[PDB]
Amino acid sequence: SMSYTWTGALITPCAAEESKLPINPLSNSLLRHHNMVYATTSRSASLRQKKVTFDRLQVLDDHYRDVLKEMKAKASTVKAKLLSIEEACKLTPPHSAKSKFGYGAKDVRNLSSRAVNHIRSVWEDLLEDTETPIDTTIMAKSEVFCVQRKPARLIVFPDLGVRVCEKMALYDVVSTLPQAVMGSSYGFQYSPKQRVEFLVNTWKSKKCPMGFSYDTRCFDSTVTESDIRVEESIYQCCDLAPEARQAIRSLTERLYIGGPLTNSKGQNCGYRRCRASGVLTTSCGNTLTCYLKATAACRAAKLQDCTMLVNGDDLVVICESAGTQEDAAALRAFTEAMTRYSAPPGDPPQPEYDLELITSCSSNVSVAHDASGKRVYYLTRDPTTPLARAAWETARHTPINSWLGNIIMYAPTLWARMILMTHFFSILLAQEQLGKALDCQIYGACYSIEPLDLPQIIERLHGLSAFTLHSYSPGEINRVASCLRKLGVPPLRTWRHRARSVRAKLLSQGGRAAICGRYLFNWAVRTKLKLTPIPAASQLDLSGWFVAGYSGGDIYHSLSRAR
Numbered sequence: 001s002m003s004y005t006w007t008g009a010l011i012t013p014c015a016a017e018e019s020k021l022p023i024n025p026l027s028n029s030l031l032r033h034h035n036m037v038y039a040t041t042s043r044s045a046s047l048r049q050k051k052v053t054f055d056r057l058q059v060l061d062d063h064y065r066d067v068l069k070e071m072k073a074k075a076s077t078v079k080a081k082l083l084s085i086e087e088a089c090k091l092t093p094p095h096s097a098k099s100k101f102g103y104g105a106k107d108v109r110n111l112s113s114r115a116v117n118h119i120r121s122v123w124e125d126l127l128e129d130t131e132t133p134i135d136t137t138i139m140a141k142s143e144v145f146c147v148q149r150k151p152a153r154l155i156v157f158p159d160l161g162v163r164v165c166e167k168m169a170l171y172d173v174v175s176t177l178p179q180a181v182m183g184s185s186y187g188f189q190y191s192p193k194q195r196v197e198f199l200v201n202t203w204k205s206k207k208c209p210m211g212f213s214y215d216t217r218c219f220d221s222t223v224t225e226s227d228i229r230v231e232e233s234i235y236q237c238c239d240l241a242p243e244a245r246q247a248i249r250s251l252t253e254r255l256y257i258g259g260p261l262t263n264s265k266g267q268n269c270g271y272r273r274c275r276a277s278g279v280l281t282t283s284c285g286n287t288l289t290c291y292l293k294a295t296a297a298c299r300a301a302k303l304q305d306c307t308m309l310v311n312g313d314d315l316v317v318i319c320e321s322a323g324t325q326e327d328a329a330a331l332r333a334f335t336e337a338m339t340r341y342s343a344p345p346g347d348p349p350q351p352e353y354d355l356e357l358i359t360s361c362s363s364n365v366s367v368a369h370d371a372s373g374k375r376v377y378y379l380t381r382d383p384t385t386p387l388a389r390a391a392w393e394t395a396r397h398t399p400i401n402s403w404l405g406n407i408i409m410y411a412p413t414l415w416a417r418m419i420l421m422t423h424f425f426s427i428l429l430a431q432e433q434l435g436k437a438l439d440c441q442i443y444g445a446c447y448s449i450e451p452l453d454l455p456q457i458i459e460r461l462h463g464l465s466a467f468t469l470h471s472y473s474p475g476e477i478n479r480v481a482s483c484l485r486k487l488g489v490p491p492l493r494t495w496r497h498r499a500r501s502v503r504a505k506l507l508s509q510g511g512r513a514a515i516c517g518r519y520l521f522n523w524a525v526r527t528k529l530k531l532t533p534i535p536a537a538s539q540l541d542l543s544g545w546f547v548a549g550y551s552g553g554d555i556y557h558s559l560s561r562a563r
């Protein structure tokens with residue numbers, strides 16, 4: 001069937017859309033080539049619509065059926081809880097899209113009578129009605145990139161009342177089932193340090209390793225009705241409350257498999273028969289579907305001793321090499337099997353014999369040295385998109401601060417330490433906002449974090465070595481330097497000067513600011529301060545940070561205030 005059908009009504013914006021980076025002194029201090037930075041808008045939605053619309057042909061075989069039964073046997077060990085309306089309300093982000101039914105995210109969080117009554121009515125409707133398609137809104141996503149343009153991605157999501165119901169029926173399932181089924185292959189259970197440990201150990205565990213990333217083109221569009229019912233068959237193996245079983249059955253047929261698309265103006269836009277990006281099951285469903293297809297395709301291809309690592313549609317496989325020619329042929333056999341399963345490739349996969357050459361989750365393993373000179377592996381990435389987005393977030397107030405999430409996840413990197421920490425600490429200190437909580441996203445869930453808490457967060461995530469790395473790889477330094485020239489970012493010497501300046505000011509303030517000066521900016525001085533374990537690090541409640549993925553799932557993981 002066709003992934004989408006369209007009526008001809010346009011994908012519309014709900015307000016004026018900004019496509020150009022503003023010319024602003026604070027953003028200009030970070031990046032001078034402002035014309036290279038853009039944001040996608042509804043103006044390119046028709047180009048995306050063409051790319052995402054196609055017929056799917058899917059053929060399943062014994063390897064697919066065998067792997068599915070293995071997955072269901074593991075899912076059969078799970079007992080999932082139904083969340084109360086109150087618990088599900090608390091998981092709603094404060095800025096989540098308002099309902100069309102007279103209330104918004106703040107009313108949900110406050111347990112307002114109108115919000116709670118409506119959510120209850122939506123829940124009862126899921127229990128009683130197993131067929132009526134649930135409405136969804138289709139919007140063009142606003143995302144920032146550097147030139148060389150990408151058309152906007154399309155986001156599809158149901159009303160706020162339905163989103164709260166999805167949490168009640170499935171939040172516990174999507175949080176616990178993926179690890180029970182996929183074990184060590186489930187990417188979202190790892191912090192960045194644990195992910196690099198798993199990749200390095202897996203690589204080294206092979207006699208003669210070969211690895212590859214597999215890029216599925218327009219993955220959400222390749223997900224078929226059959227895939228979404230297979231995914232439901234795995235969820236149905238859980239022990240579930242009867243109302244949760246019915247809600248999952250009703251959501252599967254009424255929402256997850258497909259449904260009508262409405263634009264921001266209320267016009268009938270078309271019909272979806274593939275994965276919606278903005279529902280609670282997208283991350284878990286994509287991961288399960290990708291894992292299932294790839295595990296079966298590994299068997300079809302006769303790849304030896306595979307270890308996969310999956311996060312949504314992002315897949316990396318590390319295996320035992322059978323020789324150069326044999327590996328090349330086996331990878332072609334894998335791609336053919338994936339294509340039969342409706343997971344055709346974007347970039348054709350290539351065998352890699354060096355762990356550092358593999359990009360998975362847009363990141364690569366690199367090496368630096370700690371204060372003792374010992375090798376430390378860590379994950380890095382090309383900093384172009386992080387810097388372009390940091391420039392946009394400096395010029396405009398954005399709902400999510402990607403710069404803050406990038407400092408958290410990429411804290412050991414040369415670019416996050418020299419550029420991102422320096423830039424934002426300089427601005428926030430001048431604005432007396434170092435202690436002001438900001439929203440960021442980790443594995444798709446929203447968190448409210450004070451920048452002054454970064455040292456203990458980084459210590460917990462990455463270890464104290466994240467504050468002592470030096471002697472970065474020539475390849476990594478070259479990639480950063482080239483990026484700075486391309487974007488017009490001041491050279492590293494300028495960043496060191498700015499860092500020494502903000503470090504002095506932070507130390508002068510005492511308290512949490514002085515801890516930031518000591519740990520975050522020790523790289524900027526010769527006269528190193530002593531770095532000891534931070535008392536706050538061991539008390540941090542990081543429960544729920546690296547458990548599961550929630551991209552598009554409308555999840556907020558920070559604490560709810562008592563009433």
Ligand SMILES: *c1nc2ccccc2cc1Cn1c(C(=O)O)c(-c2ccc[nH]c2=O)c2cc(C)c(F)cc21
Nearest residue numbers: 192311312313314361379405406409441442443444
């Ligand atoms: C990686 N790749 C993905 C592809 C498709 C769907 C999901 C998915 C998830 C990842 C995991 N991952 C994320 C992320 O956004 O979930 C991040 C990340 C970066 C910056 C801010 N917040 C984040 O969560 C990752 C960082 C690193 C170093 C990873 F190895 C994996 C990450």
